[PDB]
Amino acid sequence: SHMSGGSPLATGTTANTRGASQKKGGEPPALIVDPLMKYICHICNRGDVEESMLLCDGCDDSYHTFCLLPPLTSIPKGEWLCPRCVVEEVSKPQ
Ligand SMILES: [Zn+2]
Ligand SMILES: [Zn+2]
C-alpha cells in the first residue's frame, strides 16, 4: 500500500492579541465614608436629598423618592412602605 501522496496544509497566521491588564488603571481603593452610621440611599450609593429620603415602616433601609421608578410625585404623609411589603396578605411567611 503506497498511498503516501504527501500534501501538508502548512498555512500559518499571526494570531496576536495584547490583553492590556491594568487591574486598577482607573479603580482606587475607596475608604469608609460612613464609618459609624449614616442613612444612605443604597440604590444610588449616596445620601443626596435627606428631605426626600424615606425609611420603610415595614422594613429598615434608606431609599430616595428619586431612586424609585417613577419618582414619588407625593411625599408619603404617613410612614412609607417599600413596594416589596405593599404586596402583602394576612398570611405572612412567619
Ligand atoms: Zn438615592
Ligand atoms: Zn418593607
Structural domains in the chain, CATH included, are 1-94 (3.30.40.10)
Instruction: Label each residue of the chain as H, E or C.
Output: CCCCCCCCCCCCCCCCCCCCCCCCCCCCCCCCCCCCCCCCECCCCECCCHHHEEECCCCCCEEECCCCCCCCCCCCCCCCCCHHHHCCCCCCCC
Any idea which ligand is nearest the CA of 82?
2
What is the experimental method? NMR
Q: What are the grid coordinates assigned to 67, written together? A: 431612586
CB-count burial class (<10 Å; 0-12, 13-18, 19+) for 2:
exposed
Q: Which ligand is nearest to the CA of 48?
A: 1
CA of 74 from ligand 2 middle (Å) equals: 19
Alpha carbons 18 and 14: distance in angstroms, whole number: 12
Q: How far away, in angstroms, is 36 Cα from ligand 2 center?
A: 24
